[PDB]
DNA sequence: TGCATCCGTGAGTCGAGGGTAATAAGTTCTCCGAACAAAAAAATTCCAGTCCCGAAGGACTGGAAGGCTCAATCGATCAAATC
């Protein structure tokens, strides 16, 4: 048991609802495993708030029509499915929607409070044709994970609801469509292992990278009961922007930084030109230039030797 | 001696290097088509399903 | 490019001169010691030349001007 | 589960050549190579392990002061943690 | 004009394994020629032997040039004071 744990290399994000999150490498038999073992989470078990119930005044069913409206009731039911929302602290919020004017009805028209968060305000919910008619509906928001359509929802809601109350196929999970693959990956002798490539696009109300953090926790929380050179350094002491580190080194036959770094500051300072204050102008030089006490120089002297 | 760098010098070369694949009898003009390799470890030749 | 030659024979108009404008072009980096003009992208020069064509900066004529002016910078340079 | 719950941790977290150069490279003089082989020094690091004073007692300094100042050497330089094999 | 003759043709590769076998003389006799032999150079390998600015190196001569104790007496430091 010396398992090959991976490192995530990259996210290829297109926009604020989309990413391709690659990976390399895994062993054979865990690449196909994980890329499926997360896809069973992002379908059925990611908790979010969705539109559930629909109440419009003056209606009877969705097969009917409404004058002043371009579309059908089903296409207006369709829009609330493509609508994105976020209830923060509550667990059942009901909203309202009342308009007038010639034109569309975007998602600013909802009378909200501070705990319900629409990410997409340009989302049209209806189109008023002429000025005369108007839309006045009420919509309901519920919390859950996954997806339940109104077919089996009315098999599970045995309430004899009065006429005028409608119900949409709720979109609890935030994942709109994800996919994954397996290419091959190489360690420099073994060209048998498998990379992981995952393509991912979700709705708003989330980061497209936040889910793979969030959802892969939940699979793991299920398992906790189961795992239990320098230019002026080629230059003499008279030209280094300093002046009591220049005139008093060349009188020991070291006209440069060269034998300055090999020789010891207990004797070079003991000569009758330096002393106990020169170490502030040698050791601070040896801080930025790194050289040591006694160091061997790689290539110090050129052909040029001169003085002032 | 099949030494260490031998693969990764070859691996630079065969990247963007074309190659031919020919079947006898090459009975029309599409019986010999160019290809570009992607090196596998094995002993036989894997072909694309639409060729 | 790497996969087809359609978007460069939309410029050149022939299945053989696009080889021939790059048969001329892709020697200057093998033994000519030069560098391309596009981002290199670790590419072998038979498509680096194909990049220079299909980025619209090379037809057969514009190759012939940089090969003329090289010779008049050696002709009076001797004298 | 010990196998699986550790591969989620990528997800629940993550979103001198001169010194070793021997004696014969210098094309050195026949008199002083008759002496440096009489003073029993193998590498140039063993030579600068000695100083200029530790060469004068042999019969038959300006030459080394000519050639060491060219390719980036000197004399008198002390070595420690030697040899590194 | 047949009638009768004959020349010149027939998908492309992997292969899978190597080449047979018939009867056929003798005598002497003798120049053409081989490689081993066996000298006779000539070519190198060796071995000491005289020359010559340098050759490790010591010393020398020569002008120059050097470090820090004191003590009369200057001037100013220190420290009370004082406008």
From Swiss-Prot, chain B:
Post-translational events: Acetylated on several lysine residues in the presence of glucose.
Biotech uses: Co-administration of salinamide and rifampicin or salinamide and myxopyronin suppresses the emergence of resistance to both antibiotics.
Job of this protein: DNA-dependent RNA polymerase (RNAP) catalyzes the transcription of DNA into RNA using the four ribonucleoside triphosphates as substrates.
Family label: Belongs to the RNA polymerase beta' chain family.
Assembly and oligomerization: The RNAP catalytic core consists of 2 alpha, 1 beta, 1 beta' and 1 omega subunit. When a sigma factor is associated with the core the holoenzyme is formed, which can initiate transcription. The rRNA transcription and antitermination complex (rrnTAC) consists of RNAP, NusA, NusB, NusE (rpsJ), NusG, SubB, ribosomal protein S4, DNA and precursor rRNA; S4 is more flexible than other subunits.
Protein name: DNA-directed RNA polymerase subunit beta'
Natural source organism: Escherichia coli (strain K12)
Gene this protein is translated from: rpoC
Part of the whole protein covered: 403 to 453 of 1407
Swiss-Prot record, chain C:
Superkingdom as given in the UniProt entry: Bacteria
EC assignment: 2.7.7.6
Single biological process term from Gene Ontology: transcription antitermination
Enzyme class: transferase
Catalytic reactions on record: RNA(n) + a ribonucleoside 5'-triphosphate = RNA(n+1) + diphosphate
Recorded GO CC terms: cytosol; cytosolic DNA-directed RNA polymerase complex; RNA polymerase complex; transcription elongation factor complex
One GO MF term: DNA binding
Keyword terms: DNA-directed RNA polymerase, Nucleotidyltransferase, Transcription, Transferase
Membership in a protein family: Belongs to the RNA polymerase subunit omega family.
Self-association and partners: The RNAP catalytic core consists of 2 alpha, 1 beta, 1 beta' and 1 omega subunit. When a sigma factor is associated with the core the holoenzyme is formed, which can initiate transcription. The rRNA transcription and antitermination complex (rrnTAC) consists of RNAP, NusA, NusB, NusE (rpsJ), NusG, SubB, ribosomal protein S4, DNA and precursor rRNA; S4 is more flexible than other subunits.
Role played: Promotes RNA polymerase (RNAP) assembly. Latches the N- and C-terminal regions of the beta' subunit thereby facilitating its interaction with the beta and alpha subunits. Part of the processive rRNA transcription and antitermination complex (rrnTAC). The complex forms an RNA-chaperone ring around the RNA exit tunnel of RNAP. It supports rapid transcription and antitermination of rRNA operons, cotranscriptional rRNA folding, and annealing of distal rRNA regions to allow correct ribosome biogenesis.
Protein name: DNA-directed RNA polymerase subunit omega
Name of encoding gene: rpoZ
UniProtKB/Swiss-Prot annotation, chain D:
Keyword Ion transport: no
Span list, region Alpha C-terminal domain (alpha-CTD): 16-85
Residue numbers of ADP-ribosylarginine PTMs: 31
Protein origin, superkingdom: Bacteria
Keywords in alphabetical order: Acetylation, ADP-ribosylation, DNA-directed RNA polymerase, Nucleotidyltransferase, Transcription, Transferase
An example Gene Ontology CC term for this record: cytosol
Family: Belongs to the RNA polymerase alpha chain family.
Biological role: DNA-dependent RNA polymerase (RNAP) catalyzes the transcription of DNA into RNA using the four ribonucleoside triphosphates as substrates. This subunit plays an important role in subunit assembly since its dimerization is the first step in the sequential assembly of subunits to form the holoenzyme. Part of the processive rRNA transcription and antitermination complex (rrnTAC). The complex forms an RNA-chaperone ring around the RNA exit tunnel of RNAP. It supports rapid transcription and antitermination of rRNA operons, cotranscriptional rRNA folding, and annealing of distal rRNA regions to allow correct ribosome biogenesis.
Self-association state and partner proteins as the record states: Homodimer. The RNAP catalytic core consists of 2 alpha, 1 beta, 1 beta' and 1 omega subunit. When a sigma factor is associated with the core the holoenzyme is formed, which can initiate transcription. Both the N- and C-terminus interact with different regions of transcriptional regulator CRP. The rRNA transcription and antitermination complex (rrnTAC) consists of RNAP, NusA, NusB, NusE (rpsJ), NusG, SubB, ribosomal protein S4, DNA and precursor rRNA; S4 is more flexible than other subunits.
Name of the protein in question: DNA-directed RNA polymerase subunit alpha
Organism: Escherichia coli (strain K12)
Lineage: Bacteria, Pseudomonadati, Pseudomonadota, Gammaproteobacteria, Enterobacterales
Residues included from the entire protein: 221 to 324 of 329
